[PDB]
């Protein structure tokens, strides 16, 4: 029962989300191999995802983690990019959306850099790029990311090379 509501680009909610997307772009060590060569996006549309079942599932778990961690859910807004975003918004995150090969274990990954999530929109390491041109730097085809509310709780700190 997901319905999607288009935010108007005049809406302060739209602008705020766009700002968090544009300002968290960075350069990547792969020279653009996986996600393309770019400094910014052209944002074509932003939609609020409303699903009641899924939301109650989120906040019930939130309350659990909260109580296990000095009443601090440690809630963030973070990016997630994958070929499966249409399933995610209808059916919820689960094991299908996990990154088995991942550096920090087989779980669901999220990025503070929008440009990091962008590298996964067409698969691990960009896969073979956009479906229509097979181009990992395609400037034409429409891409899709999620901006998600994530409960971290007590988070294990793992420095990385």
């Amino acid at each position: 029962g997901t319905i999607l509501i288009d935010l108007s680009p005049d809406d302060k909610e739209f602008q705020s989300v766009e700002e968090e997307m544009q300002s968290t772009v960075r350069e990547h060590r792969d020279g653009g191999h996986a996600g393309g060569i770019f400094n910014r996006y052209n944002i074509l549309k932003i939609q609020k995802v409303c699903n009641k079942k899924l939301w109650e599932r989120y906040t019930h778990r939130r309350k659990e983690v909260s109580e296990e961690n000095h009443n601090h859910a440690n809630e963030r807004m973070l990016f997630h990019g994958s070929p499966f975003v249409n399933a995610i918004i209808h059916k919820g995150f689960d094991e299908r959306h996990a990154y088995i090969g991942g550096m920090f274990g087989a779980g669901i990954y999220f990025a503070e850099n929008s440009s990091k999530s962008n590298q996964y929109v067409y698969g691990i390491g960009g896969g073979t790029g956009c479906p229509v041109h097979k181009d990992r730097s395609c400037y034409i085809c429409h891409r899709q990311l999620l901006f998600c509310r994530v409960t971290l709780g007590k988070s294990f700190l793992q420095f990385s090379a």
């Binding site: 996006y41 939130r62 995150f93 550096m103 990954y109 999220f110 409960t151």
Partner: protein, 47 residues
């Protein structure tokens, strides 16, 4: 799907070499994320 480090609810990967790379996070329950916004976009070719 793997498990959380005992006594923790998530992992934070803080890059230590690239001082401009921000954090990446991993969770191990689907119930710990809610996909609030769907952004449709193009990357832009630099001038």
């Amino acid at each position: 799907m793997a498990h959380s480090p005992p006594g923790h609810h998530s992992v934070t990967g803080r890059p230590s070499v690239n001082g401009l790379a921000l954090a990446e996070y991993v969770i191990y329950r689907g119930e710990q994320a809610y996909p609030e916004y769907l952004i449709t976009y193009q990357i832009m070719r630099p001038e």
